[PDB]
Amino acid sequence: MKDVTIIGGGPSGLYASFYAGLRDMSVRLIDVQSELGGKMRIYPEKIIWDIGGIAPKPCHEILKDTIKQGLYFKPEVHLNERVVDIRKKAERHFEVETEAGEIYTSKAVIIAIGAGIINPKQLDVKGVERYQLTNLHYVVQSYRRFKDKDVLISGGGNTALDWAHDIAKIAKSVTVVYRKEDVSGHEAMKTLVTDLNVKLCPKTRIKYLVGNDDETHISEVVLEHVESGDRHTVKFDDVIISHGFDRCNTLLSETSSKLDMHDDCRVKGFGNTTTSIPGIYACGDIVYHDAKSHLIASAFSDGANAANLAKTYIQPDANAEGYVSSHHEVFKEANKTIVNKHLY
Amino acid sequence: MKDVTIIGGGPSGLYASFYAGLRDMSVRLIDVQSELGGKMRIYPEKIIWDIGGIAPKPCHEILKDTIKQGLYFKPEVHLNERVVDIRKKAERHFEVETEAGEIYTSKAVIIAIGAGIINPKQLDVKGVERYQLTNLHYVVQSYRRFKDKDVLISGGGNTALDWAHDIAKIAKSVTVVYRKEDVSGHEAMKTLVTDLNVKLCPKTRIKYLVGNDDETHISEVVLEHVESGDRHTVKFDDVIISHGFDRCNTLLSETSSKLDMHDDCRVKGFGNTTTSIPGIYACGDIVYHDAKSHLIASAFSDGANAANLAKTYIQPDANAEGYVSSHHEVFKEANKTIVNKHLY
Numbered sequence: 001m002k003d004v005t006i007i008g009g010g011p012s013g014l015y016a017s018f019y020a021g022l023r024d025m026s027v028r029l030i031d032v033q034s035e036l037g038g039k040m041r042i043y044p045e046k047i048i049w050d051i052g053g054i055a056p057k058p059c060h061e062i063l064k065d066t067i068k069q070g071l072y073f074k075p076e077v078h079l080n081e082r083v084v085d086i087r088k089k090a091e092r093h094f095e096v097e098t099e100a101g102e103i104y105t106s107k108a109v110i111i112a113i114g115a116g117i118i119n120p121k122q123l124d125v126k127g128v129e130r131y132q133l134t135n136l137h138y139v140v141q142s143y144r145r146f147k148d149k150d151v152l153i154s155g156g157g158n159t160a161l162d163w164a165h166d167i168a169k170i171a172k173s174v175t176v177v178y179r180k181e182d183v184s185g186h187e188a189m190k191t192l193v194t195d196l197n198v199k200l201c202p203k204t205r206i207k208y209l210v211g212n213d214d215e216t217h218i219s220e221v222v223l224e225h226v227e228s229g230d231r232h233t234v235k236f237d238d239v240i241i242s243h244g245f246d247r248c249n250t251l252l253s254e255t256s257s258k259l260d261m262h263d264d265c266r267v268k269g270f271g272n273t274t275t276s277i278p279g280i281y282a283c284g285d286i287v288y289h290d291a292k293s294h295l296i297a298s299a300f301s302d303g304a305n306a307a308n309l310a311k312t313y314i315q316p317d318a319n320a321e322g323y324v325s326s327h328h329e330v331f332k333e334a335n336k337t338i339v340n341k342h343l344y
Numbered sequence: 345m346k347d348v349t350i351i352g353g354g355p356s357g358l359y360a361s362f363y364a365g366l367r368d369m370s371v372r373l374i375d376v377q378s379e380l381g382g383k384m385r386i387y388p389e390k391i392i393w394d395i396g397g398i399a400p401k402p403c404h405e406i407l408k409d410t411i412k413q414g415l416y417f418k419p420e421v422h423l424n425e426r427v428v429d430i431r432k433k434a435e436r437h438f439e440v441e442t443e444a445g446e447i448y449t450s451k452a453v454i455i456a457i458g459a460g461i462i463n464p465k466q467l468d469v470k471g472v473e474r475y476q477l478t479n480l481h482y483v484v485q486s487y488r489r490f491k492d493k494d495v496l497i498s499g500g501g502n503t504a505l506d507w508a509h510d511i512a513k514i515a516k517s518v519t520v521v522y523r524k525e526d527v528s529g530h531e532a533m534k535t536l537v538t539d540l541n542v543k544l545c546p547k548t549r550i551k552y553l554v555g556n557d558d559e560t561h562i563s564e565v566v567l568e569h570v571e572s573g574d575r576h577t578v579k580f581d582d583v584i585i586s587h588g589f590d591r592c593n594t595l596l597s598e599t600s601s602k603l604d605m606h607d608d609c610r611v612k613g614f615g616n617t618t619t620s621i622p623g624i625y626a627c628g629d630i631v632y633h634d635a636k637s638h639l640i641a642s643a644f645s646d647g648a649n650a651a652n653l654a655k656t657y658i659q660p661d662a663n664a665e666g667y668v669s670s671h672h673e674v675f676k677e678a679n680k681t682i683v684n685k686h687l688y
């Protein structure tokens with residue numbers, strides 16, 4: 001029987017996988033996406049600066065390193081598989097069941113599902129290459145940059161509609177294209193509908209992202225009606241791609257085992273990655289504890305803690321923490337080649 | 345007046361410096377060593393694997409990246425300076441005083457002192473280069489590798505004497521060279537003295553670390569008596585350099601402001617980097633909270649949390665957390681050059 005099943009292949013699940021391997025635990029890693037990376041697959045061309053010890057470079061580049069790390073010890077990896085239920089048969093005996101009916105057994109379970117299912121939108125860029133785009137946004141925090149700008153927002157989820165309203169306060173115009181399979185959320189919509197500089201475009205998708213010359217920005221967007229198929233090209237200064245996150249619609253609402261939940265539908269972490277059920281640990285954006293940050297850095301330190309607690313759960317007399325890698329015997333064979341051949 | 349004074353230039357203080365800069369805070373960074381890096385300056389040639397997202401490479405290489413990160417926003421850096429006192433004159437008004445009598449003012453204080461003063465021993469290696477040594481150890485956790493080995497340990501601190509005893513259980517012989525300025529600790533010494541395969545060498549230092557041929561290991565060590573100056577060369581299979589850490593002998597025992605302390609002389613973190621005094625935050629190995637790991641990864645996530653809490657302390661209406669770097673406006677000018685010139 002596998003030592004631990006890890007649900008979620010984002011940076012938190014990946015590091016948890018690595019550190020569980022560092023602690024000599026057999027690992028099963030499950031993720032619904034066709035590739036590992038979680039939310040990081042949303043913003044591949046973006047330059048990341050705030051990961052500890054990592055000089056700024058594209059997210060997809062850092063992701064490649066993070067994935068490699070998660071797979072050093074070669075865990076049992078299951079992609080394109082969606083967990084729907086978690087069960088505790090007994091102590092050191094858990095069942096993890098997918099929507100396809102597959103049932104996986106483990107002595108422990110690590111939940112690293114972030115905010116739920118990630119399904120990145122496939123953007124088709126013409127004229128420019130995506131890796132050099134500047135006016136393409138996947139999240140809105142500061143919106144002062146959008147002053148007097150013609151802004152496009154894709155997605156009609158509550159968060160996207162909130163962004164639209166805030167941006168509308170100073171933007172020249174805001175256009176929201178979406179499909180109404182998006183929530184869309186009555187209150188967020190009611191607020192937005194009286195922003196008279198906002199155009200709502202239901203049943204509409206982004207077909208093409210177009211930029212001229214060489215340029216490093218999108219200058220115009222080809223929009224397409226989902227039903228009629230009619231297209232028209234509109235110029236924008238900024239394009240914002242929302243994804244629609246709802247932490248309240250994960251499996252944790254309808255599994256066969258209910259962890260205590262934070263009021264925002266995050267798993268209640270008891271000081272750390274410990275949950276209300278012994279043997280189950282939550283790491284990353286899904287868990288709440290006082291030391292949390294919404295950062296990849298925090299996802300990593302959570303992963304370590306989840307692996308440690310899972311290790312001591314399976315084997316109580318084991319060390320509380322893992323051996324530091326600098327003096328860990330498992331890396332020595334590789335270290336000599338790395339040093340001798342200067343593989344860094 | 346400076347926003348925050350950060351005491352300690354290890355990975356935790358460095359990231360805290362970076363993230364404080366990310367949150368648009370003015371920073372003063374103080375460390376007693378002649379160079380930044382903290383404990384990482386102890387094991388520069390060692391290959392590190394367990395930092396999130398970072399492929400294995402020498403510690404000094406990762407340190408260079410970590411230092412660069414800590415200094416992006418160009419804080420006020422004070423090296424070769426030892427803090428001896430911390431004072432809270434009023435809310436958003438702190439005094440940080442060094443042994444030389446210098447007094448620095450800040451609206452907040454971040455304590456990142458690890459286990460206390462770090463003063464790396466200068467090893468002189470002959471025959472081989474340090475970067476390829478394998479049998480050189482700076483910490484002992486697993487000691488099974490020392491079975492039937494002739495082992496040398498430098499340092500007579502309690503921890504080093506504990507290592508010596510454990511190793512003596514399976515080693516062919518253990519030699520402990522030290523100066524008695526080291527504790528040495530009565531009980532640890534009393535335990536060790538009846539290990540009849542252990543040779544105690546007081547008033548003795550390591551002069552030379554010698555390896556033959558090209559080789560990737562130390563084959564023999566030149567020892568020197570501190571008083572007489574007499575030398576003799578002894579062959580060893582492994583060399584262990586202890587440093588002597590005592591968390592109970594930091595400034596936190598005799599400042600003008602007492603944080604609540606964990607029973608192991610670590611600062612009591614209230615769920616995170618929060619201490620018993622508003623405006624003072626502890627990040628890294630110095631602080632205890634339930635989400636802690638003794639890892640660089642945890643030092644980083646602590647640093648972020650300490651910067652955030654310090655930010656909201658100085659400016660209560662500010663956002664709880666900082667803007668993700670991927671969409672942070674402060675990095676955009678640099679991002680275009682990084683992308684255009686492929687500087688990664």
Ligand SMILES: Cc1cc2nc3c(=O)[nH]c(=O)nc-3n(C[C@H](O)[C@H](O)[C@H](O)COP(=O)(O)OP(=O)(O)OC[C@H]3O[C@@H](n4cnc5c(N)ncnc54)[C@H](O)[C@@H]3O)c2cc1C
Nearest residue numbers: 008010012032038039083114118284285295296668669670
């Ligand atoms: C646009 C954007 C920009 C960001 N920029 C930065 C930045 O610059 N620096 C930084 O530190 N952080 C940044 N972040 C945050 C960072 O991406 C997250 O903190 C991090 O991805 C969280 O890692 P995680 O593993 O905990 O969750 P996730 O990354 O969300 O991983 C969850 C994975 O588990 C999968 N999954 C979920 N549910 C189930 C199920 N029931 N069955 C199977 N599989 C499943 C999901 O599909 C997903 O792949 C950014 C976030 C976004 C959205």
Ligand SMILES: Cc1cc2nc3c(=O)[nH]c(=O)nc-3n(C[C@H](O)[C@H](O)[C@H](O)COP(=O)(O)OP(=O)(O)OC[C@H]3O[C@@H](n4cnc5c(N)ncnc54)[C@H](O)[C@@H]3O)c2cc1C
Nearest residue numbers: 324325326352354356376382383427458462628629639640
């Ligand atoms: C030999 C060894 C191997 C390790 N290997 C790994 C590994 O492979 N992976 C990993 O993740 N971790 C590893 N670690 C642990 C890692 O080094 C620590 O977790 C990390 O350095 C802690 O960072 P810090 O900033 O909190 O403390 P520190 O690194 O100790 O930084 C403290 C700094 O503040 C300075 N300072 C202290 N006090 C005062 C004062 N009163 N005034 C002024 N200045 C001051 C100190 O001199 C020091 O420079 C290892 C530790 C050691 C000793």
